[model samples]
Target: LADGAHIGNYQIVKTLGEGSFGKVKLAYHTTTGQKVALKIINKKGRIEREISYLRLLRHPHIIKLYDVIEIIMVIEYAGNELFDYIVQRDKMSEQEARRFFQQIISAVEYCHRHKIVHRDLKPENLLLDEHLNVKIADFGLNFLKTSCGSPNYAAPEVISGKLYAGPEVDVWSCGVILYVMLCRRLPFDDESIPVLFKNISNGVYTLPKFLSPGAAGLIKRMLIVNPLNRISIHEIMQDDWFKVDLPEYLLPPDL
Candidate 1:
């Protein structure tokens, strides 16, 4: 636990979560008093792979990796985890949800351009920073065949047992995340794992009656049952509903 312990330049404030290898903790930089997340884990290439991906990424909404001590990663620490944020307020207005979705989708688009597939995109790791901006966390870089992730957030291609390319599944997960943000509920929620998969695999879920059809229409395009027809991130960036009140920096550099 080591709640007040010091490791090199970081002073531990609290333990964050149990990582696949070890503990992820909250720490502060002794030199700068800046908060950071210490992802204390190691498996040789596994940790190194994460480090490399983070080093190449420098987006505003993506959590920043600062320094590494052997196996542990010192990265930016963000408050208000989305899992709790969503619980704190079960529903949201269109603009607030739209802001959150835009930030996440932008970061996801950046990852896709870099050839990484974040198979995990549930509410757990996303953070609402002090400024209330959405920040993505717990990135799982690199892509592959075979599929295993939260059944509720799993793409049809994944639940269908078919091979999935990197971007399509990510878009599907992003779609589900956005759906939850807007509708305050899961589209394919079920206790039976098989039934959950059945619903997701069949595109069988209802949009809440409270939802405006403007965003509802976009979700339909984003959450297609087939990867072949799912809206690409580029397409999403151009959608009318998504483009309203869009920030200037969110546009692709050349566009």
Candidate 2:
């Protein structure tokens, strides 16, 4: 949709971006004059599932769903996607990376506690506000048992055609995201899909020397080939790298 387009009571200001399910537009609410994201999806099933999952999630780190009108969803307007931020900075410092990673973990932990599973968790699905705070978005594939997720961030169990728990799969993807934040590159990458899958299934990857021992240790535990051996979200919180006291600004208001 072009700028100035109309969708119900919302006026399109600009195109924010596109996703597998649909495109998101920066829109203006006619009555409140508030800027928001209007995501228009074509598939009814996908949009409905996304609405169901999002309705169950309410946290500072997770995107807020204001309203839904048929195939259109009204969401909060974020400054940019995590991928765009990461690409602009090349790589974030350990301190900055840890802060963002902590928020991501917090959001995932909250979802799991609510019995919700974010099947697809990656940089592209994470949004940043003006303050650069993380907001987990795009729950189109949440709570599903079928095979899905970005190849680079997918867990070995998912790739091996094995039925897996939701939290574990999300954990693996979180590990991949953390790896990218620290290194500005994927842990497993290859021109050949087969080779990439082989590497991921084998859990073959090296941590850069720049990564602190604590950070490296956490990553190793998270990226474990066997989901059974992978570190849980609770354990991640207790890890040395994550045990540091965060600044007041880094924490959610209710925390």
Candidate 2 lDDT, 89-108, residue by residue in tens: 75567888888899899888
User: Which candidate wins on lDDT?
Assistant: 2
> CA RMSD for every model?
3.8, 4.5
Clashing pairs in 2: none
lDDT, model 2, position 149: 67
Worst 10 residues of 2 by lDDT: 138-147
Residues 1-255, candidate 1: write the lDDT tens digits: 367678888888877676457677888889998888887765534646667767778777888787778377788788788767766765667887888788888888887777777777776658888888778876746132123577788798777767655578888888888888887789898989888988898899898877777789888887898788999998898888998898977777854
- Model 1 local distance difference test score: 0.78
Instruction: Give the runs in model 1 whose Cα sits over 4 Å from its true position.
Output: 1-4, 20-22, 41-50, 140-148, 161-165
Among all windows of 10 consecutive residues in model 1, the one with the lowest summed lDDT is 139-148
